[PDB]
Amino acid sequence: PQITLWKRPLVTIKIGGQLKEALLDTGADDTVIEEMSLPGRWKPKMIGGIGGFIKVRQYDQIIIEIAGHKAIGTVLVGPTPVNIIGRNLLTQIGATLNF
Amino acid sequence: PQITLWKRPLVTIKIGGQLKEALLDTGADDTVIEEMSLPGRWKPKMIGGIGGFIKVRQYDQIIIEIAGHKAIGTVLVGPTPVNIIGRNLLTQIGATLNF
Numbered sequence: 001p002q003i004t005l006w007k008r009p010l011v012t013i014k015i016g017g018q019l020k021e022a023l024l025d026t027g028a029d030d031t032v033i034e035e036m037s038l039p040g041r042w043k044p045k046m047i048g049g050i051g052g053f054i055k056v057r058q059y060d061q062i063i064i065e066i067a068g069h070k071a072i073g074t075v076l077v078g079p080t081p082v083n084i085i086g087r088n089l090l091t092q093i094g095a096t097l098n099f
Numbered sequence: 100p101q102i103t104l105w106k107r108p109l110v111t112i113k114i115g116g117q118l119k120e121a122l123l124d125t126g127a128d129d130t131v132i133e134e135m136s137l138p139g140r141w142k143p144k145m146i147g148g149i150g151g152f153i154k155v156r157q158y159d160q161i162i163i164e165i166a167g168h169k170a171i172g173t174v175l176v177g178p179t180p181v182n183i184i185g186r187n188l189l190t191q192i193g194a195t196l197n198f
């Protein structure tokens with residue numbers, strides 16, 4: 001699809017058996033999802049943005065369906081106000097910015 | 100151009116006669132620039148990101164060249180870690196997300 005930016009680029013994602021809405025975010029290096037339960041080992045990480053830093057749990061090798069496209073990568077879980085699909089997964093679905 | 104996302108989508112901007120580097124950020128509603136002096140009166144705004152809220156100064160009808168494309172619009176100035184080009188200006192240069 002071609003997504004215009006008059007509105008937030010929100011899509012439906014499937015992760016950990018749950019459906020969620022998430023923002024396609026070219027400004028995010030990594031993918032950050034609100035507090036949920038995921039299987040496997042995790043390690044703690046601090047990530048920073050506007051306002052400062054939050055502590056997240058880093059899960060590796062997570063499968064996520066983004067607008068019907070399967071992709072795998074690291075997912076950070078923590079108290080983010082919005083679910084964010086970052087560049088580490090946008091590349092896997094072949095997303096580009098065009099102008 | 101067509102910009103893939105294996106690297107941060109950084110571009111050169113020209114604002115107030117200075118060259119700066121900025122991130123093309125589909126996850127940002129508005130454009131946020133580091134501390135500088137800009138012309139005119141400003142209004143207050145409170146914006147929230149991943150790590151809380153910051154106070155910024157809102158300047159309207161500012162001329163900004165983004166990767167050679169002229170835009171004229173609202174710029175927020177404050178303690179952001181990186182210069183961010185948000186959707187308010189991405190729409191002016193015709194940017195879309197494609198996959």
Ligand SMILES: COc1ccc(S(=O)(=O)N(CC(C)C)C[C@@H](O)[C@H](Cc2ccccc2)NC(=O)O[C@H]2CC[C@@H]3C[C@H]4CO[C@@H](C)[C@@]42O3)cc1
Nearest residue numbers: 025027028029030048049050082126127128129146148149
């Ligand atoms: C290592 O991995 C990562 C991954 C993600 C982040 S990040 O999340 O800190 N960040 C990074 C950039 C700010 C440099 C990604 C960036 O796209 C971020 C995502 C977002 C959107 C909503 C809520 C929370 C986060 N946008 C945003 O802060 O926008 C703000 C600021 C501009 C206007 C004013 C606000 C109104 O509400 C939001 C939409 C805002 O739009 C950092 C590190």
Ligand SMILES: [Cl-]
Nearest residue numbers: 072073074088
């Ligand atoms: Cl990854």
Ligand SMILES: [Cl-]
Nearest residue numbers: 091094103104
């Ligand atoms: Cl590619």
